[PDB]
Ligand SMILES: CC(=O)Nc1ccc(O)c(-c2cc(C(=O)O)ccn2)c1
Ligand SMILES: [Mn+2]
């Protein structure tokens with residue numbers, strides 16, 4: 001109602017059916033913030049121990065160089081040589097790169113935005129893989145069983161990090177820039193272990209305002225691409241958002257907790273120290289209209305585009321002809337929960 005980030009605490013019985021619970025948190029309005037936390041039942045664990053992954057290879061570690069001032073920044077991601085987790089961790093916990101001393105989140109937050117452009121960190125990002133054991137059937141990021149699977153059930157198409165899992169090994173001050181998901185999908189993020197990850201979110205109903213702000217500050221960027229925020233290079237501080245009246249909220253994700261982003265929910269954030277997160281995209285019936293209307297990067301060829309055709313055919317058959325003819329003028333109402341939420345309404 002205030003479009004603020006909500007947190008949920010499912011029972012183990014509730015935790016069993018992933019799609020149904022997302023339908024439930026949406027019936028509670030969680031999607032309005034564009035971001036929600038889910039704390040799993042105490043009984044649940046995805047892997048017995050994380051002690052046997054020191055030899056896992058991070059194929060393409062990136063150094064995050066950041067340039068900018070007064071709350072506006074551009075981030076250049078520079079690929080470094082491959083690396084084992086053990087090698088990463090020891091860099092991460094080294095004195096040069098480890099978390100500074102701090103009392104409250106607010107202080108660490110100030111330190112992040114103050115030292116953003118100094119001493120570039122390394123982010124072990126976009127590693128193909130899962131840390132779930134094969135037997136875990138609840139909230140398994142490797143096989144969430146949502147209608148996004150249609151991309152690989154009806155079509156034979158695989159998209160790394162999108163319907164397959166990605167691992168993110170973070171250290172202090174590693175960042176994810178402001179962005180929505182590819183095709184404005186949902187995403188799920190599970191923090192396996194380590195120091196926290198802090199998130200900023202803008203409600204989907206005020207997302208355009210964020211985009212107008214960004215276009216204002218980066219007009220050359222705006223001109224050379226229709227959706228340059230999809231480059232995931234743009235950092236904008238909470239003080240800049242507050243100054244220009246963009247509504248937003250912030251939340252800190254601890255180890256063992258899930259974050260869900262919702263369609264067209266802009267988010268950004270940073271890692272507090274050494275940690276590991278797993279994520280992928282997923283969809284619900286509500287996403288389809290977002291997919292249909294998503295504005296994509298127009299300046300790169302290696303970017304993610306999902307043929308919406310099969311989703312329209314299967315879930316909106318009465319609109320298929322109209323859509324295919326270019327006359328579908330459905331307007332998205334960001335406050336409405338996905339259809340599956342009828343059960344709880
Ligand atoms: C390097 C890249 O393609 N960026 C990217 C693409 C899609 C995403 O969902 C995220 C992302 C990453 C995180 C994270 O690094 O923890 C959190 C939320 N979103 C980051
Ligand atoms: Mn994301």
Ligand SMILES: [Zn+2]
Pocket residue numbers: 224225226227228231297298299300
């Ligand atoms: Zn582009």
